[PDB]
Amino acid sequence: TTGWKQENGMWYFYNTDGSMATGWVQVNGSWYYLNSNGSMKVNQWFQVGGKWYYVNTSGELAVNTSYRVNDNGE
Amino acid sequence: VAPTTGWKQENGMWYFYNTDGSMATGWVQVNGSWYYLNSNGSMKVNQWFQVGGKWYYVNTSGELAVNTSIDGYRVNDNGEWVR
Amino acid sequence: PTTGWKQENGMWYFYNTDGSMATGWVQVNGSWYYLNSNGSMKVNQWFQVGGKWYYVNTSGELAVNT
Known part of the structure; x- marks a missing residue:
């Protein structure tokens, strides 16, 4: 599935072909x-880039809330 | 080598610029x-558009709509309209 | 800033317009x-992901069909 x-x-997130997503995934916004x-x-809070x-x-990634976070959530 | x-x-x-100065065309994936x-x-x-x-x-x-519904159109993990 | x-x-490295670095898979030009x-x-290198x-x-560049 x-x-x-x-x-x-x-x-875990499974793409159509079978493959596993890693990294950022957007689901329903x-x-x-x-x-x-x-x-x-x-x-938890984590560090990338x-x-x-x-x-x-x-x-889900917290965005536009509170420490502050923006539309990207940085 | 290209300056930008x-x-x-x-x-x-x-536009997306390659290091060889040429512009990228087609699908681009970057930063998720x-x-x-x-x-x-x-x-x-x-907009809506069709490829293949x-x-x-x-x-x-x-940025491509994925794993969601757009005006009632259900899109894939790779943005394809399905149902 | 570039x-x-x-x-x-x-x-x-790849920088986004907002000055942030991109991370993970990238596809351009195929x-x-x-x-x-x-x-x-x-x-x-050989690396494992998922x-x-x-x-x-x-x-x-990622090797495919070889």
């Missing part, structure tokens, strides 16, 4: 970040 | 977002 | 490239 798939309580092993980052970003328990 | 590269805007349109560039290297913006039979939608930032 | 492809200390978390382009191995040549 395609899209979000939970395996052992862990979230929200941003998510995947680790290089495809697993979804959750509930020298900018700080925060994802909640659902894995 | 990547995204450049001219006449209210965005897909964009589409016409034959003359100009970026598509705020398949329908795609870009917003006003040229 | 944006676009930039070579810094022998490595290739070629793929992978930028590390720190924005640096992977060159001349449980799979990949190879990029000395130009940073």
Whole structure:
């Protein structure tokens, strides 16, 4: 199957061909970040490209809120 | 070697410049977002378009709609209209 | 301040218009490239992403069908 798939309580994103997304994924307007092993980052602040970003328990990137964050969420 | 590269805007349109001075055309993926560039290297913006039979939608930032619904049209992980 | 492809200390980076560095997979002109978390382009190596191995040549370009 395609899209979000939970395996052992862990979230992964499967593209149409079968392949696993990694990196930033946009789903329904929200941003998510995947680790290089495809697993979804959750509930924490992390650093990529020298900018700080925060994802909640659902894995969505917090944007335009509070430390501040913009449309990109930096 | 080209003195300016990547995204450049001219006449209210965005272009992508290669290090060999040529402009990129077709699909571009950068920083998690897909964009589409016409034959003359100009970026598509705020519209539906068709490539290889398949329908795609870009917003006003040229960034491709993915994993979502646009005016009731359901788009793929790679922005293709399906249902 | 400069944006676009930039070579810094022998490595290739990509800058966004807002001055930020792009990260992860890049496709342009049909070629793929992978930028590390720190924005640096992977060159001349086998690397694993999502449980799979990949190879990029000395130009940073991902090898396909070879």
